[PDB]
Design a protein around this ligand. Sequence first.
Ligand SMILES: COc1ccc(-c2c(-c3cc(-c4ccc(C)c5ncccc45)c(O)cc3O)noc2NC(C)=O)cc1
Length: 207
Amino acid sequence: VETFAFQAEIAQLMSLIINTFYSNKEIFLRELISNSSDALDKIRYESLTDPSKLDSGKELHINLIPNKQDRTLTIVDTGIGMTKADLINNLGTIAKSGTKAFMEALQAGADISMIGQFGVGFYSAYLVAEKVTVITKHNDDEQYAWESSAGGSFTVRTDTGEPMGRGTKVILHLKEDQTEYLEERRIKEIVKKHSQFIGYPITLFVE
Ligand SMILES: COc1ccc(-c2c(-c3cc(-c4ccc(C)c5ncccc45)c(O)cc3O)noc2NC(C)=O)cc1
């Protein structure tokens, strides 16, 4: 297990997300689904010139899986998946500029729901999760587990859990007062409100 420091700007963003009073938390789901959609777009595009990239799974879709026992909401996609370099360096590098822009926009009257317009929507997960665990698998690379409870650091390890195939699984360990996001009616409502036209099937599992 390797432990890494977030870039200072990203740690600042995470603290803002955790500390700011902001009631419209439900937008976290749209942001995560948007990320899944982007990843699905990419594997779809690449498969057009190299069909063998779908050897790790032809189905392009998103599953939403609530588990009341574990107090988790999991967002699973069969997108392109992330490499170790994505997790440690490259997505953070990209997030720096977006974070800066978002912070500045907030100072000028934007609100937290607009986070995705700055390309850093993943971090909205921390509106509802005390810890986020991300399992990801890119073709020709190993399966990784990324994890953070904020506080300025994250971990990455090679994952020996159940093999995924290809894609990304975001496991939201929900805060004690945010269990509404385990309820079928609530998740359905949010998907219809904010993610109605996503171009991949979204299956909401029930318990
Ligand atoms: C908005 O920027 C991105 C969106 C999706 C992805 C992504 C993902 C993916 C990442 C995330 C994601 C998960 C976890 C973290 C820390 C992320 N940080 C920045 C951007 C995305 C992150 C996710 O929630 C779902 C996803 O399907 N899997 O392969 C990907 N690769 C390509 C080039 O897009 C990467 C960047």
